[PDB]
mmCIF file of all heavy atoms in Angstrom:
data_model
loop_
_atom_site.group_PDB
_atom_site.id
_atom_site.type_symbol
_atom_site.label_atom_id
_atom_site.label_comp_id
_atom_site.label_asym_id
_atom_site.label_seq_id
_atom_site.Cartn_x
_atom_site.Cartn_y
_atom_site.Cartn_z
ATOM 1 N N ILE A 3 93.362 117.896 89.497
ATOM 2 C CA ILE A 3 94.521 118.091 90.362
ATOM 3 C C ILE A 3 95.782 117.795 89.548
ATOM 4 O O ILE A 3 95.702 117.199 88.471
ATOM 5 C CB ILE A 3 94.437 117.201 91.609
ATOM 6 C CG1 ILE A 3 94.419 115.718 91.221
ATOM 7 C CG2 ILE A 3 93.155 117.533 92.380
ATOM 8 C CD1 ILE A 3 94.630 114.855 92.468
ATOM 9 N N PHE A 4 96.946 118.203 90.068
ATOM 10 C CA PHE A 4 98.217 117.962 89.369
ATOM 11 C C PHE A 4 99.204 117.210 90.258
ATOM 12 O O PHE A 4 99.332 117.503 91.437
ATOM 13 C CB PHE A 4 98.847 119.294 88.957
ATOM 14 C CG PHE A 4 97.927 120.030 88.011
ATOM 15 C CD1 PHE A 4 97.118 121.072 88.482
ATOM 16 C CD2 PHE A 4 97.891 119.675 86.657
ATOM 17 C CE1 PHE A 4 96.273 121.757 87.599
ATOM 18 C CE2 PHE A 4 97.047 120.361 85.775
ATOM 19 C CZ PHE A 4 96.239 121.402 86.246
ATOM 20 N N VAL A 5 99.935 116.262 89.661
ATOM 21 C CA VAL A 5 100.957 115.504 90.392
ATOM 22 C C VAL A 5 102.295 115.679 89.681
ATOM 23 O O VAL A 5 102.418 115.370 88.499
ATOM 24 C CB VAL A 5 100.609 114.012 90.450
ATOM 25 C CG1 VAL A 5 101.647 113.287 91.319
ATOM 26 C CG2 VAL A 5 99.224 113.823 91.078
ATOM 27 N N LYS A 6 103.304 116.157 90.405
ATOM 28 C CA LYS A 6 104.638 116.344 89.821
ATOM 29 C C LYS A 6 105.558 115.186 90.206
ATOM 30 O O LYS A 6 105.505 114.683 91.329
ATOM 31 C CB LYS A 6 105.250 117.679 90.287
ATOM 32 C CG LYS A 6 104.848 118.800 89.320
ATOM 33 C CD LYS A 6 105.456 120.114 89.788
ATOM 34 C CE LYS A 6 105.071 121.233 88.819
ATOM 35 N NZ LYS A 6 103.591 121.257 88.654
ATOM 36 N N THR A 7 106.411 114.772 89.257
ATOM 37 C CA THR A 7 107.351 113.677 89.495
ATOM 38 C C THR A 7 108.758 114.211 89.767
ATOM 39 O O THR A 7 109.072 115.377 89.529
ATOM 40 C CB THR A 7 107.405 112.738 88.291
ATOM 41 O OG1 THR A 7 108.064 113.380 87.210
ATOM 42 C CG2 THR A 7 105.995 112.325 87.864
ATOM 43 N N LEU A 8 109.570 113.315 90.267
ATOM 44 C CA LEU A 8 110.959 113.645 90.590
ATOM 45 C C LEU A 8 111.743 114.019 89.337
ATOM 46 O O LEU A 8 112.801 114.642 89.430
ATOM 47 C CB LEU A 8 111.647 112.454 91.257
ATOM 48 C CG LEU A 8 110.905 112.072 92.538
ATOM 49 C CD1 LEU A 8 111.544 110.812 93.131
ATOM 50 C CD2 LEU A 8 110.975 113.219 93.563
ATOM 51 N N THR A 9 111.244 113.622 88.161
ATOM 52 C CA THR A 9 111.949 113.917 86.907
ATOM 53 C C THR A 9 111.459 115.211 86.262
ATOM 54 O O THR A 9 111.976 115.628 85.226
ATOM 55 C CB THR A 9 111.854 112.743 85.931
ATOM 56 O OG1 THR A 9 110.505 112.594 85.511
ATOM 57 C CG2 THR A 9 112.320 111.458 86.617
ATOM 58 N N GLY A 10 110.494 115.872 86.902
ATOM 59 C CA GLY A 10 109.990 117.152 86.398
ATOM 60 C C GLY A 10 108.749 117.021 85.521
ATOM 61 O O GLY A 10 108.361 117.964 84.832
ATOM 62 N N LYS A 11 108.128 115.845 85.558
ATOM 63 C CA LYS A 11 106.923 115.623 84.755
ATOM 64 C C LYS A 11 105.686 116.006 85.565
ATOM 65 O O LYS A 11 105.655 115.779 86.770
ATOM 66 C CB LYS A 11 106.801 114.151 84.358
ATOM 67 C CG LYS A 11 105.689 113.976 83.323
ATOM 68 C CD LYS A 11 105.584 112.499 82.940
ATOM 69 C CE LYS A 11 104.477 112.319 81.902
ATOM 70 N NZ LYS A 11 104.825 113.086 80.673
ATOM 71 N N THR A 12 104.657 116.556 84.911
ATOM 72 C CA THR A 12 103.418 116.921 85.625
ATOM 73 C C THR A 12 102.254 116.106 85.055
ATOM 74 O O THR A 12 102.031 116.105 83.845
ATOM 75 C CB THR A 12 103.130 118.418 85.476
ATOM 76 O OG1 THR A 12 104.213 119.160 86.020
ATOM 77 C CG2 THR A 12 101.851 118.757 86.248
ATOM 78 N N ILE A 13 101.499 115.431 85.930
ATOM 79 C CA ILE A 13 100.342 114.636 85.493
ATOM 80 C C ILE A 13 99.049 115.287 85.983
ATOM 81 O O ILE A 13 98.971 115.740 87.122
ATOM 82 C CB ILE A 13 100.390 113.198 86.051
ATOM 83 C CG1 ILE A 13 101.840 112.706 86.055
ATOM 84 C CG2 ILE A 13 99.534 112.271 85.180
ATOM 85 C CD1 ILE A 13 101.893 111.223 86.434
ATOM 86 N N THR A 14 98.025 115.303 85.123
ATOM 87 C CA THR A 14 96.726 115.874 85.493
ATOM 88 C C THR A 14 95.745 114.735 85.743
ATOM 89 O O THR A 14 95.654 113.806 84.940
ATOM 90 C CB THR A 14 96.202 116.774 84.368
ATOM 91 O OG1 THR A 14 97.136 117.815 84.124
ATOM 92 C CG2 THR A 14 94.862 117.382 84.781
ATOM 93 N N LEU A 15 95.019 114.794 86.862
ATOM 94 C CA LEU A 15 94.058 113.738 87.205
ATOM 95 C C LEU A 15 92.688 114.335 87.498
ATOM 96 O O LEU A 15 92.589 115.443 88.022
ATOM 97 C CB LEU A 15 94.542 112.985 88.450
ATOM 98 C CG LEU A 15 95.933 112.384 88.203
ATOM 99 C CD1 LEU A 15 96.487 111.850 89.528
ATOM 100 C CD2 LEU A 15 95.846 111.235 87.187
ATOM 101 N N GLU A 16 91.631 113.566 87.225
ATOM 102 C CA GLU A 16 90.270 114.009 87.541
ATOM 103 C C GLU A 16 89.876 113.298 88.828
ATOM 104 O O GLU A 16 89.910 112.069 88.897
ATOM 105 C CB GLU A 16 89.295 113.658 86.412
ATOM 106 C CG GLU A 16 87.890 114.145 86.775
ATOM 107 C CD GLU A 16 86.914 113.800 85.657
ATOM 108 O OE1 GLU A 16 87.302 113.064 84.764
ATOM 109 O OE2 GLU A 16 85.792 114.278 85.707
ATOM 110 N N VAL A 17 89.529 114.067 89.859
ATOM 111 C CA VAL A 17 89.164 113.483 91.151
ATOM 112 C C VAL A 17 87.989 114.208 91.789
ATOM 113 O O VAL A 17 87.615 115.309 91.387
ATOM 114 C CB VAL A 17 90.356 113.570 92.104
ATOM 115 C CG1 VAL A 17 91.530 112.759 91.555
ATOM 116 C CG2 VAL A 17 90.766 115.037 92.251
ATOM 117 N N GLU A 18 87.453 113.580 92.831
ATOM 118 C CA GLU A 18 86.353 114.147 93.609
ATOM 119 C C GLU A 18 86.860 114.331 95.043
ATOM 120 O O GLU A 18 87.738 113.580 95.465
ATOM 121 C CB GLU A 18 85.150 113.199 93.595
ATOM 122 C CG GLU A 18 84.565 113.123 92.182
ATOM 123 C CD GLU A 18 83.734 114.368 91.892
ATOM 124 O OE1 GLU A 18 82.588 114.404 92.313
ATOM 125 O OE2 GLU A 18 84.254 115.268 91.254
ATOM 126 N N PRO A 19 86.378 115.284 95.815
ATOM 127 C CA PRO A 19 86.890 115.459 97.196
ATOM 128 C C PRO A 19 86.721 114.206 98.050
ATOM 129 O O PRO A 19 87.441 114.013 99.033
ATOM 130 C CB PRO A 19 86.100 116.649 97.782
ATOM 131 C CG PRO A 19 85.540 117.351 96.578
ATOM 132 C CD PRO A 19 85.336 116.275 95.499
ATOM 133 N N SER A 20 85.757 113.363 97.682
ATOM 134 C CA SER A 20 85.487 112.137 98.431
ATOM 135 C C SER A 20 86.385 110.987 97.990
ATOM 136 O O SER A 20 86.320 109.900 98.566
ATOM 137 C CB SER A 20 84.025 111.730 98.267
ATOM 138 O OG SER A 20 83.689 111.721 96.885
ATOM 139 N N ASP A 21 87.242 111.212 96.996
ATOM 140 C CA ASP A 21 88.144 110.157 96.555
ATOM 141 C C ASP A 21 89.179 109.942 97.643
ATOM 142 O O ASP A 21 89.656 110.886 98.286
ATOM 143 C CB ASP A 21 88.833 110.559 95.245
ATOM 144 C CG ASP A 21 87.882 110.382 94.064
ATOM 145 O OD1 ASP A 21 86.917 109.650 94.205
ATOM 146 O OD2 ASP A 21 88.134 110.984 93.033
ATOM 147 N N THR A 22 89.542 108.669 97.810
ATOM 148 C CA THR A 22 90.548 108.285 98.781
ATOM 149 C C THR A 22 91.934 108.398 98.165
ATOM 150 O O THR A 22 92.094 108.330 96.951
ATOM 151 C CB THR A 22 90.348 106.846 99.243
ATOM 152 O OG1 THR A 22 90.484 105.970 98.135
ATOM 153 C CG2 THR A 22 88.970 106.659 99.881
ATOM 154 N N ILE A 23 92.930 108.539 99.017
ATOM 155 C CA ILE A 23 94.313 108.617 98.562
ATOM 156 C C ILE A 23 94.686 107.314 97.851
ATOM 157 O O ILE A 23 95.355 107.337 96.821
ATOM 158 C CB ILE A 23 95.221 108.891 99.762
ATOM 159 C CG1 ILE A 23 94.926 110.283 100.350
ATOM 160 C CG2 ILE A 23 96.692 108.783 99.354
ATOM 161 C CD1 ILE A 23 95.100 111.384 99.302
ATOM 162 N N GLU A 24 94.227 106.180 98.386
ATOM 163 C CA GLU A 24 94.501 104.888 97.752
ATOM 164 C C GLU A 24 93.913 104.899 96.343
ATOM 165 O O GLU A 24 94.508 104.364 95.412
ATOM 166 C CB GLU A 24 93.884 103.748 98.569
ATOM 167 C CG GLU A 24 94.192 102.403 97.904
ATOM 168 C CD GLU A 24 93.608 101.267 98.738
ATOM 169 O OE1 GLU A 24 92.864 101.556 99.661
ATOM 170 O OE2 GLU A 24 93.913 100.124 98.440
ATOM 171 N N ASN A 25 92.742 105.511 96.198
ATOM 172 C CA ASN A 25 92.105 105.573 94.883
ATOM 173 C C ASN A 25 92.958 106.433 93.953
ATOM 174 O O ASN A 25 93.135 106.105 92.783
ATOM 175 C CB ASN A 25 90.698 106.162 94.981
ATOM 176 C CG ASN A 25 89.773 105.177 95.684
ATOM 177 O OD1 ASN A 25 90.236 104.316 96.433
ATOM 178 N ND2 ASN A 25 88.488 105.245 95.480
ATOM 179 N N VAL A 26 93.495 107.529 94.489
ATOM 180 C CA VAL A 26 94.342 108.416 93.696
ATOM 181 C C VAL A 26 95.595 107.666 93.240
ATOM 182 O O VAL A 26 95.990 107.768 92.078
ATOM 183 C CB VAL A 26 94.726 109.667 94.489
ATOM 184 C CG1 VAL A 26 95.759 110.481 93.705
ATOM 185 C CG2 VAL A 26 93.481 110.519 94.748
ATOM 186 N N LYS A 27 96.214 106.894 94.147
ATOM 187 C CA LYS A 27 97.404 106.125 93.797
ATOM 188 C C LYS A 27 97.060 105.149 92.674
ATOM 189 O O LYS A 27 97.852 104.930 91.763
ATOM 190 C CB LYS A 27 97.892 105.289 94.982
ATOM 191 C CG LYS A 27 98.477 106.157 96.117
ATOM 192 C CD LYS A 27 99.658 105.395 96.761
ATOM 193 C CE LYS A 27 99.948 105.947 98.164
ATOM 194 N NZ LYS A 27 100.379 107.370 98.060
ATOM 195 N N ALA A 28 95.873 104.554 92.768
ATOM 196 C CA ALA A 28 95.440 103.587 91.768
ATOM 197 C C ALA A 28 95.330 104.252 90.401
ATOM 198 O O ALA A 28 95.678 103.657 89.382
ATOM 199 C CB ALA A 28 94.104 102.954 92.167
ATOM 200 N N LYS A 29 94.864 105.492 90.385
ATOM 201 C CA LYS A 29 94.741 106.227 89.134
ATOM 202 C C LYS A 29 96.131 106.480 88.543
ATOM 203 O O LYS A 29 96.329 106.354 87.339
ATOM 204 C CB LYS A 29 94.031 107.561 89.371
ATOM 205 C CG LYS A 29 92.558 107.311 89.700
ATOM 206 C CD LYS A 29 91.857 108.654 89.937
ATOM 207 C CE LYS A 29 90.367 108.435 90.271
ATOM 208 N NZ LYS A 29 89.555 108.584 89.031
ATOM 209 N N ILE A 30 97.106 106.788 89.415
ATOM 210 C CA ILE A 30 98.490 107.003 88.980
ATOM 211 C C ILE A 30 99.062 105.698 88.418
ATOM 212 O O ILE A 30 99.773 105.716 87.419
ATOM 213 C CB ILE A 30 99.344 107.537 90.136
ATOM 214 C CG1 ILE A 30 98.890 108.979 90.427
ATOM 215 C CG2 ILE A 30 100.829 107.511 89.734
ATOM 216 C CD1 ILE A 30 99.720 109.596 91.554
ATOM 217 N N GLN A 31 98.751 104.571 89.053
ATOM 218 C CA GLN A 31 99.249 103.275 88.584
ATOM 219 C C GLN A 31 98.755 103.029 87.164
ATOM 220 O O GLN A 31 99.500 102.568 86.298
ATOM 221 C CB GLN A 31 98.708 102.171 89.502
ATOM 222 C CG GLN A 31 99.178 100.796 89.015
ATOM 223 C CD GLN A 31 98.666 99.710 89.954
ATOM 224 O OE1 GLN A 31 97.947 100.002 90.910
ATOM 225 N NE2 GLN A 31 98.994 98.465 89.737
ATOM 226 N N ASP A 32 97.492 103.322 86.957
ATOM 227 C CA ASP A 32 96.891 103.109 85.651
ATOM 228 C C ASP A 32 97.606 103.938 84.585
ATOM 229 O O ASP A 32 97.797 103.483 83.457
ATOM 230 C CB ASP A 32 95.408 103.495 85.699
ATOM 231 C CG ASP A 32 94.743 103.234 84.349
ATOM 232 O OD1 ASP A 32 95.454 103.140 83.363
ATOM 233 O OD2 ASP A 32 93.528 103.129 84.324
ATOM 234 N N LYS A 33 97.954 105.173 84.934
ATOM 235 C CA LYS A 33 98.598 106.084 83.987
ATOM 236 C C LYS A 33 100.114 105.872 83.833
ATOM 237 O O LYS A 33 100.642 106.035 82.733
ATOM 238 C CB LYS A 33 98.374 107.534 84.427
ATOM 239 C CG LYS A 33 96.862 107.840 84.593
ATOM 240 C CD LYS A 33 96.524 109.190 83.946
ATOM 241 C CE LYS A 33 95.065 109.545 84.234
ATOM 242 N NZ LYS A 33 94.754 110.877 83.644
#
């Protein structure tokens, strides 16, 4: 999946459909 930031940056993450949003946020925190 891809996450875009307010500054125009795009981040790519590896996820599963069963992943929780909290889990996704945690992955962003790590990165």
